[PDB]
Structure formats: structure tokens, C-alpha cells
């Protein structure tokens, strides 16, 4: 119940033969997994972190210019040459300057003039890559136990370290069996297209090709104290004002320009371990060995009293918190739901089956009431605690919200949203294959399109669809216009 | 000669004394005494709890 209150949770409920259900973790939301006889637990991918990062390429952000040396030839003969030109550390440029008797040359006319300065770089920008060998995912799993201090408690949990070498690490929950994780960590944010821009103690996960296409001069990338820099011509600005001579000026410090050139990148915390916090992971949940505590306990026949007022969460759960008043401590809590004094039992306990483990140890229950009046009976007898509640909503509204949530998931996850909570099945396989093919084609088409250009192109294409009448309307409009507007209204995550 | 200035615009800033306040749902916006100071730049946001 470290999952309550996040506002991003989403409940997986299915189960199959061998009781395996694959769910997807996104660093933002915490999954909840309910089952018929398995204790409902919750999962959250805490932090993805890498280690032993190599440096692929180094970029200069600002420079200093010293030792400006110049040389000119007599006009109409030869071309100005300078021994310092061949040096890798020196930036040079050739220009033509008028010369005459005033300048000492014999014959009037334009003559070449080369100026060579010393480009000693400063404030490098390292660009680091990570191999899949060292990437590590940490996963936290908690079963709904009804402990006193376990409402959205970020700390207490069970951690399982997942690495590509050994990706089938199974958690060992106390008194609940062993939840088995068999996940593929190769999929996810493809780290073969990630270069970390460690630039003055701020990292970023940019695309590889975009990093290679940064105009700033690039170094060899090896570990040296005086690396040679290629493409130095664009961070020093030679200025030939009029035609008498030319000066040499260093451009400046490119940090502010870099920060606005990274306006779409995702930030990652870089201090010590480069613990990335954005990303997603697909994992299978093998719940065969997993059991629930105290299925055989007797029922409670005593008084129950609320110790904290019931307050509905964002998704409809109400978080009942009660304390036992009887003398039989190792006992099971009863439950009942009536809509309009009718035992329709149209409710559900997101907790598996809450049980009191001590006489006066408070226990908290997460129940899902129906959409109307819902009288909830906890104890038995005339002393049964009665929690009146009223969930304000409609069933169709919940379906619309679920559809919107699924659409957002399909927009963020490429096609793994088709596997999120996909309990086996053959229909989901065909859906995933179709979506994979069409999404690959669609992203190959709309590679690197603006937040507003997507909306504009979508409007234009849906208008084209509404115009054409050769049954191109039906596919053009539906397949491109609506999809592209929906995407372009979401892309800026 | 004899140029008169009329605007100074900044390039290099420095952020000091970051302070935060938060409040429960349906209890109003968070308020902080440092808002009524020229040097302070302060932005609201929404958090879940």
C-alpha cells in the first residue's frame, strides 16, 4: 500500500494458467496486481541506475584565444603561408587585404592575409554512453498487509535487483511466499541511442545522432589533459572589417545556448551513481509460489471502531482504517456492502482479506465502493461498524477515463502498452503485431516533428480526408488526423 | 561620446535560498513570506499527497 496517493496507479486484475501476468513499470506510476486467491500487492520501479560509464565524445563549450600570429604576402603572387598553420592547436583563416606602397608592397592589388590563433579549450562537455552489461533496475514490491504505518510509505518494501545478466531475480516476501519476476530488461529506453551530457554537473539522456550533430567542436573523447579539437572554425569568429586587416575573437560561453538547445531532453540526476529516473520496464509476474497469510483464521465477533476518518482517494479507493476491540487477536476481519439496504455485495476489497494480528494494533483497509450509496458493514452482530459512503460518479465516466488512460499509455509506451497487464491471449498478440508494424511506419514518417507541426499536419490531413471521396477519407482521416492531433497534444511530456 | 545608459539586462544569474511550502487539498494555495520581495522569484505548482 506504498502505492496509495500517487495518483498514477493502475490496477492489473487478470491471471492465467501458471498464474503469470506481465505488467509495465514507468517510474511514474505504481502497479497494483489483484487476483482471486493471491494477496493483492503493488509494484513500483524505484530507480534505474548504470555504472562504469565510458566517454564517447567530448564537446567544447567555450574557448580562450592567445598568440594571435599573422602573415601576408605581396599581392598577385603566391598565397600567404605560416608554419603555425599545420599545428593542430591553431585555428587559421585566409583573407585578401588591399596592399600598396603605403603597406610596402611593390605592386598594388589585393593580397592574402592569414591569421592563426591558439584555441585552448575550456569547460568541456563530456558525452557518455552506457553498455547494457552494467545497467541495473531496482524493483520494490509490497503486499497489502494492513500494517499500522503502511499508507503510501515510500520506504518500507522488498527490493529485487534486475540486471541483463540475471534478469529473473525473484523477491522473497515475508509470510507471503515468493513473487517471481521474469522480466526482459533489454527492451525499454534503448540505451544504444543515449548519450549523457555531463555538462557542469547536469546530465541528460539525448538521442545519439542529435548529440553527434551538435555544431560545437568535438574532441577525440579519450582521457587526456590537452586533447586536440576538430572543427574549431565555428567557435572563433575572424572579423575582416573593411579590408586593411582582420582580427580574431573567441565566440563566448555556449552554456545558455546549450540549455535552450536541450529544451526537449529528459533530465537525469548525476551525482555519484548516474541514477536515471526516467524510463520504463516490462516485467512478468509469476505468482505461482505466492500465498496469502491467514486464510484459515477464524472470524472476528467484536466491536470495530474507526481511528481515522475514511477519505476517498483519487481513483475511488476509500482507505478504511479500523482498530479491533476484542480479545481474540489472530483473527480475520469480516466485511459487507449493501446498496440501499440490499445485499448485492457490489463492492470489492483491493486488500486481499485484512486480518488483525494484535489486539489493539490498528489495521487499515482499502475498499472500492460502488457508484451510488454504499453502506459498509465490517463487524458482525448489533455492534457492526457502519461506514456510510457515496462515490460521486457514473459507470460510463469511468469507462471514458479508462480509455483516456489507455490512450495516454499507448502514446507514451510505443507498443508495450499492448502487453501492459496482457494476460496471455491470442487477440492481444495480433493487436501488438498490428500496432507494432503501423507504429513503426508512423514514427519513421513523423520522426522529429514539432509539438505544433504535428497538430498543423494533422488538421491539414484530416481536412484532406474530409475532402476526398475515393474511400481515402475513411483511412486518411481516422488513421492520421485524429491520431496526430492526439499525439501532438501530448508529446511535450 | 558621453553615452547615457537606460537598461541593464542580465545574462548570468545565481539562485540562492530555495524555500518551499505545501498545503492539503482544498486548503488554498501555498503562501510564503518571501513572495513580497523584489529579489525573490517564486512559482506555484501542484503536488499530490
Amino acid at each position: 500500500m506504498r502505492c496509495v496517493g500517487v495518483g498514477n496507479r493502475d490496477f492489473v486484475e487478470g491471471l492465467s494458467g501458471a498464474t503469470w501476468v506481465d505488467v509495465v513499470l514507468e517510474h511514474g506510476g505504481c502497479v497494483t496486481t489483484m487476483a482471486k486467491n493471491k494477496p493483492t500487492l503493488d509494484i513500483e520501479l524505484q530507480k534505474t541506475e548504470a555504472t562504469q560509464l565510458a566517454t564517447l565524445r567530448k564537446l567544447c563549450i567555450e574557448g580562450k584565444i592567445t598568440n594571435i600570429t599573422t602573415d601576408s604576402r605581396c599581392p598577385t603572387q603566391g598565397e600567404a603561408v605560416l608554419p603555425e598553420e599545420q599545428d593542430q592547436n591553431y585555428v587559421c583563416k585566409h583573407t585578401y587585404v588591399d596592399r600598396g606602397w603605403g603597406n610596402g608592397c611593390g605592386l598594388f592589388g589585393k593580397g592574402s592575409l592569414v591569421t592563426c590563433a591558439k584555441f585552448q579549450c575550456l569547460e568541456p562537455i563530456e558525452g557518455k554512453v552506457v553498455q547494457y552489461e552494467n545497467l541495473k533496475y531496482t524493483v520494490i514490491i509490497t503486499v497489502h498487509t494492513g500494517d499500522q504505518h503502511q499508507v503510501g510509505n515510500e520506504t518500507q518494501g522488498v527490493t529485487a535487483e534486475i540486471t541483463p545478466q540475471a534478469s529473473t531475480t525473484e523477491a522473497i516476501l515475508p509470510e507471503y511466499g515468493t513473487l517471481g519476476l521474469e522480466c526482459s530488461p533489454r527492451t525499454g529506453l534503448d540505451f544504444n541511442e543515449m548519450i549523457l551530457l555531463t555538462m557542469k554537473n547536469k546530465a541528460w539522456m539525448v538521442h545519439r545522432q542529435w548529440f553527434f550533430d551538435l555544431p560545437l567542436p568535438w574532441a577525440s573523447g579519450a582521457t587526456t589533459e590537452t586533447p586536440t579539437w576538430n572543427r574549431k572554425e565555428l567557435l572563433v569568429t575572424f572579423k575582416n572589417a573593411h579590408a586593411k586587416k582582420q582580427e580574431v575573437v573567441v565566440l563566448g560561453s555556449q552554456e545558455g545556448a546549450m540549455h535552450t538547445a536541450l529544451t526537449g531532453a529528459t533530465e537525469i540526476q548525476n551525482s555519484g551513481g548516474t541514477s536515471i529516473f526516467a524510463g520504463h520496464l516490462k516485467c512478468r509476474l509469476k505468482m505461482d509460489k505466492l500465498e496469502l497469510k491467514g486464510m484459515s483464521y477464524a472470524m472476528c465477533t467484536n466491536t470495530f471502531v474507526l481511528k481515522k476518518e475514511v477519505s476517498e482517494t483519487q481513483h475511488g479507493t476509500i482507505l478504511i482504517k479500523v482498530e479491533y476491540k476484542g480479545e481474540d487477536a489472530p483473527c480475520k476481519i469480516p466485511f459487507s456492502t449493501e446498496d440501499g439496504q440490499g445485499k448485492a455485495h457490489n463492492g470489492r476489497l483491493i486488500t486481499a482479506n485484512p486480518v488483525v494480528t494484535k489486539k489493539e494494533e490498528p489495521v487499515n483497509i482499502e475498499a472500492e465502493p460502488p457508484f451510488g450509496e454504499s453502506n459498509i458493514v465490517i463487524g458482525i452482530g448489533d455492534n457492526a461498524l457502519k461506514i456510510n459512503w457515496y462515490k460521486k460518479g457514473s459507470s460510463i465516466g469511468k469507462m471514458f477515463e479508462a480509455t483516456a488512460r489507455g490512450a495516454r499509455r499507448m502514446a507514451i509506451l510505443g507498443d508495450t502498452a499492448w502487453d501492459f497487464g496482457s494476460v496471455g491471449g491470442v487477440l492481444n498478440s495480433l493487436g501488438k503485431m498490428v500496432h507494432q508494424i503501423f507504429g513503426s511506419a508512423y514514427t519513421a514518417l513523423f520522426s522529429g516533428v514539432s509539438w505544433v507541426m504535428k497538430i498543423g499536419i494533422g488538421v491539414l490531413l484530416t481536412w484532406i480526408g474530409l475532402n476526398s471521396k475515393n474511400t481515402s477519407m475513411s483511412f486518411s482521416c481516422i488513421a492520421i488526423g485524429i491520431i496526430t492531433l492526439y499525439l501532438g497534444a501530448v508529446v511535450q511530456a | 561620446t558621453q553615452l547615457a545608459t537606460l537598461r541593464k539586462l542580465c545574462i548570468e544569474g545565481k539562485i540562492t535560498n530555495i524555500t518551499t511550502d505545501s498545503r492539503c487539498p482544498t486548503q488554498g494555495e501555498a503562501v510564503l513570506p518571501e513572495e513580497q520581495d523584489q529579489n525573490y522569484v517564486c512559482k506555484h505548482t501542484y503536488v499530490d499527497r
Partner: antibody
Framework: QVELVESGGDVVQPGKSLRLSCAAS????????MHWLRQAPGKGLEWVAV????????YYADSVKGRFTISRDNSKNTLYLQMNSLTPEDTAVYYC???????????????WGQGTLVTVSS | HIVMTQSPLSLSVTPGQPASISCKSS????????????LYWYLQKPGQSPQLLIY???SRFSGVSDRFSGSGSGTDFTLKISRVQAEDVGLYYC?????????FGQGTRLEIK
């Protein structure tokens, strides 16, 4: 690229006051808090006094509190330190430290001056 | 008046070897409002003026070699050097910037073994 050069350091007998001056260059001075730090020979670095961006606000180390005075001539782009009632203990190499270029602390050191030596002895 | 105690007082290490310097505080230097930890590490090279290596607990300063990295959360901070060169001779004075009367440590010394 910034250059902080010391000035005013010389010999002085105990009890005779001295005024130190820190000349600054390479940056806009009026926006930077400045510090005075000293290192007695064979002793750890010991911060002396700080003046913030606004001229009025100043602070001094308790070991030297009430004996020194720190002033800012930002129009000339230089810092002033006034040493009064000097003690033979108060002999050290004195430094002039700028405010941090990037960070969160209102007062920090990023660039240290070349250093001047003041000797208080008889 | 937080007093800074450093664990090592002399560190003689051969070149191409790691090194660990410890600067232990008398109080947690973690500013509550921002959650940062203001501990600085300077190096005064012999016959030179002090530099600034790591302007936080672990975020190194500009112009500093690749090997200098720090750590520590509340009171036990470290300065890790990966491969010692011949230029690392100096005095690694740590410092706390949490409180106004900021005080340096005694400062360790590094020499080539």
C-alpha cells in the same frame, strides 16, 4: 580569466594599524560578495571577514571580531580591509576570495587572490 | 562554529593508485530548505594559492581533473582520487559552508610514496 591581486602588505610593529587593499579585475565587482582569508605559516586556512553584495552587510570571525574593518570601493573595483590593534599572532598570508560563480550558497569561494604577507613583530 | 575533523593527516601514496580523504563534521551540514549539503574541498598546491576542487559534497568544480570525486550524506564525507599523479602534492583543506562563521579543517597532506 578573473584576476585578484593583493596590495598593502608590509611589516608592522604590534599595535600599529594597517589597511589592506584587494584590487579586483575580470568581472563586475558590485554584484559579488567578497571575503578576506588568512593562512598563518604552517597553520590551517582561517576565514577572516565577509562583505556581501550590499555594502552595508558585513560579518567578521569571532577570533578577529572587533579588531578589523572591511570596506568595499566598488566604484574603483577594489576591496578594502582595515586591520586595527594588530597582534603578533595576527601575522599570516592574507587572501581575497570572490563569491561563487555557480551554486546555492550566498557566500562561497571560487577564486583566490595571489596572496599578501603581513608580519606583526618587534 | 561547526568544527571540521579530518581523518587522515598524512597520505603517502604511490602514483597510479587511489586515495581516500575523510572530513567528518561535528553536525549535519544539510540545509533543510533545499536539501543540499554544503561541504567544499580546496587544494593549496605547494608554493601556490588554494583552488576549489568540489564545490559541493560530490559536484566537482570546473577545470578539475576527471578523477576527483566526493561522497558523504550527513557527517562522514570523502574525497576519492582514482589515479594519483605527481601533481597531487598539496593540502586538501575541506570546508563547511552551512553556517556563517565557516571553519576549515586542519587539512591533510599528500606525498608520493
Amino acid at each position: 580569466q578573473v584576476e585578484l591581486v593583493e596590495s598593502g602588505g608590509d611589516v608592522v610593529q604590534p599595535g600599529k594599524s594597517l589597511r589592506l587593499s584587494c584590487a579586483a579585475s575580470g568581472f563586475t565587482f558590485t554584484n559579488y560578495a567578497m571575503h578576506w582569508l588568512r593562512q598563518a605559516p604552517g597553520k590551517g586556512l582561517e576565514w577572516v571577514a565577509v562583505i556581501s553584495s550590499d555594502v552595508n552587510d558585513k560579518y567578521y570571525a569571532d577570533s578577529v571580531k572587533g579588531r578589523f574593518t572591511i570596506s568595499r570601493d566598488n566604484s574603483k573595483n577594489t576591496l578594502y580591509l582595515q586591520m586595527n590593534s594588530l597582534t603578533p599572532e595576527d601575522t599570516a598570508v592574507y587572501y581575497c576570495a570572490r563569491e561563487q560563480a555557480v551554486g546555492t550558497n550566498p557566500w562561497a569561494f571560487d577564486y583566490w587572490g595571489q596572496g599578501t604577507l603581513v608580519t606583526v613583530s618587534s | 562554529h561547526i568544527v571540521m575533523t579530518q581523518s587522515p593527516l598524512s597520505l603517502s601514496v604511490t602514483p597510479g593508485q587511489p586515495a581516500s580523504i575523510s572530513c567528518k563534521s561535528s553536525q549535519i551540514s544539510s540545509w533543510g530548505s533545499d536539501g543540499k549539503t554544503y561541504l567544499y574541498w580546496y587544494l593549496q598546491k605547494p608554493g601556490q594559492s588554494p583552488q576549489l576542487l568540489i564545490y559541493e559534497v560530490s559536484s566537482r568544480f570546473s577545470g578539475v581533473s576527471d578523477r576527483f570525486s566526493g561522497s558523504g550524506s550527513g557527517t562522514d564525507f570523502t574525497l576519492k582520487i582514482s589515479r594519483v599523479q605527481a601533481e597531487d602534492v598539496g593540502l586538501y583543506y575541506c570546508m563547511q559552508g552551512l553556517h556563517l562563521p565557516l571553519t576549515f579543517g586542519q587539512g591533510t597532506r599528500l606525498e608520493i610514496k
